[model samples]
Target: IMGSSVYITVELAIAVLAILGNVLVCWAVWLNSNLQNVTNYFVVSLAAADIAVGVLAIPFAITISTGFCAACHGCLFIACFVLVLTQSSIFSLLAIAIDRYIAIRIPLRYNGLVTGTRAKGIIAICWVLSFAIGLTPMLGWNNCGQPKSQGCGEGQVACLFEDVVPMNYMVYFNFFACVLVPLLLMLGVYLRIFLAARRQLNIFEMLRIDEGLRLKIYKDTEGYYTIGIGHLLTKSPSLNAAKSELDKAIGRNTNGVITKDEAEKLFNQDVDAAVRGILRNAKLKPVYDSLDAVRRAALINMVFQMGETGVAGFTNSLRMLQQKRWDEAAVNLAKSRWYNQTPNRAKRVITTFRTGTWDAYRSTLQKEVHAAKSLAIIVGLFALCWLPLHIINCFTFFCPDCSHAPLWLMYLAIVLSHTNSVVNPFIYAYRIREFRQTFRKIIRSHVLRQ
Candidate 1:
């Protein structure tokens, strides 16, 4: 009953930091509407895994750290529980990494590729994998050894360090599967992103240089003046004289530069064009192919709005689409509340779904893309904070105590790793201005109430 120890401070700090950091992060995202999106859904899940570590794992670690355990099984349970939470966090990051890879590399297709349902599905698989690995030791793969204390119980299976199968094959398997593989994948994705960014900068520079080569106003040998971009000339000598401009051009014309307003408009239009392209080449491509172009466009419009799950909920309509029963699919579409809630859009969608007529729905896909950016800071910090813990773990695979490493080093490594959960809230508050703005408002509101 030595509850009155200074070590309690370390344990308490960890527990509090882990819990509050993650809770506040979830709250932070909720409080800031700008922070909410399909991508941040993974960030939220990642924070949740950290919360689980604080609530389930760290509390048990504290007991061990303080030299107190109600029973040896309790320690084992803590070990297994923490394993689950930690693995869950690792895999969630991996999922986030992959999500980002798709977002950056294939910006045009990210919406169709990493839909809400698919994100949820990936998260679910991470949890399943965590549990599957965590339960391995509990399911007879554990090291049941002599009791840590002198208490002689009649029938008690206690956890012990002596008989622990640290160098077991399963341990190696779990390490490689959970940490090494995922870490390498994230590194590979980040490298590709860096290279792509570098390539873009080069392209921009080349464009600048190329712009200088264009003739602003060139006097042909025939005494006729030609002005503008590389518009082909009717006369061969006029073209031959233009090539001299590359060697000695007067100046590049500013005519090709668009106005800021036109640039914005063009970008918006381009985003919709990209969205349409994504729909055209989507995995659902074959399913919508049988329909006329108008019907396909209408169906894609609905797909963009409701996402894959909500649209797929029109079960009969989808089935009808598969069966090539257009009229029946149209009736099915009209019968649903998806039609009721969205009267005009639904009218267009239903008619298109049935009669094969297209009505364009302006895309808010650019806004969705904007929302994905908010999670970048959170994810980057998470990777930086957690990377050390994983590296330390790689060494532990060879020896349970990490025989080559000092005891203090092990403690420090864990503390640093657990610090990730704490660092996330700070990162969110500092890096995301909207989160900070919302946080201040919330604080002010509470203060005013008091």
Candidate 2:
């Protein structure tokens, strides 16, 4: 068994880190112009919850762990208070996920959709729901008047979480219904966001060359029937098959035509195939990983124009790119049949590979990618830290006859869950350039001052 001294020391350390780290997160959002947005507003709300965990929850948790609270009502209320803060954190994460989904799914209308006042309204709703959910046990769902084997000496009840808070509420209401549901929803939302952002990136890059967005199918330079933004219908089994599928998806029968939306759907399917092909290619995956967003889009453009085999034929250029010899890669690309056939498009693509610089569209795409990546990491960490404790809670409740987890293990799990609150600042510093800059400025001005 772990000693209370060691557990309390570890808990205190986590509390300090959580307090300091989350304060920096809030400060970074407040002081930085770039961080002031709807998605980040949700982040600030999450930080606020973490701050509460550090200031209030962790201390109460330590007291509860040591079984030190005085009255039965006070003990249950302290436990309920911790639940409120954690519930708020979970709601804040869900809010961020929904905000990001809206931003990615409807980029043009995002500003109108999530204005500042509306964002605050959503944040308020999250906190309200959190309070309602967290304090449910307090409103008579608890084991307050139940017969207890061990009562606090002389008419006092021992302030223990298991004794006062019912396992049914923890497992059924809190973990399974409330926490697990939102977590699964967030998982789906983030997965969709990953694909959605990548598709947007590819579409933006491909539009530079494939300028034609016709609803009617037409023959390409090589005499293949194509529609939309270079979606080759010939690649399907038959034109009729492709037409029916498009008609079904678009909800219209245009004979041999498609709507702009149908064309985009077909184009996304093609781009997804190209993306998977690149990732599956052993030679290209590492090279692709090594390149920046602009250059990665350039390679995706190449793979889209000519199939993966055609791009794979540039083995020497791929080797050069793997080594980041951009100029040599550009030269090797220029010597290809693709460059000779479509010199104008190939020249621009090669220039991107060589310069590794962003055009206007590329810059916007890069920023979106960065923001999405940071959010992914945040959500990923939240899942990693919180899942274990909840899983243990479920196991203990559902499998009571089975051997119970050790006390030390439960303590470690609590510490691990608290670690989530401590790590977000590090993630922000590592992933977000704006956050890093703001953090440095704040640190130098405040901590390093004379």
- Candidate that would win on TM-score: 2
lDDT per residue, candidate 1, 1-450, as tens digits? 443454456756877888876787787678777877676787788889888777767666655554433444555675567667777877776777677667655554478777878778888988998887866666667655432444535334334332232435234656566666776777676666545444422211221222211224444445554433222233445544544532233233234333333333433443355346545654455566666656665655665456555665666677688688878887778778877876666765665566553222212223323434444554566566666655555566655565655666756666666676777666667767776776666656744563
Query: Any residue pairs clashing in model 1, and if so which?
Result: none
Give the Cα lDDT of each candidate. Answer: 0.58, 0.79
Best by lDDT: 2
Candidate 2: give its CA RMSD in angstroms: 10.8
- lDDT for model 2 comes to 0.79
**Backbone N/Cα/C clashes per model:** 0, 0
Give per-residue CA lDDT, model 2, range 172-286, as digits (tens): 9998888889889988988888775455444444553345566776667776667777766665546686677557656788777876667777677776788899999987888
lDDT of model 1 at position 442: 64
Kindly state the number of residue pairs that clash in model 2: 0
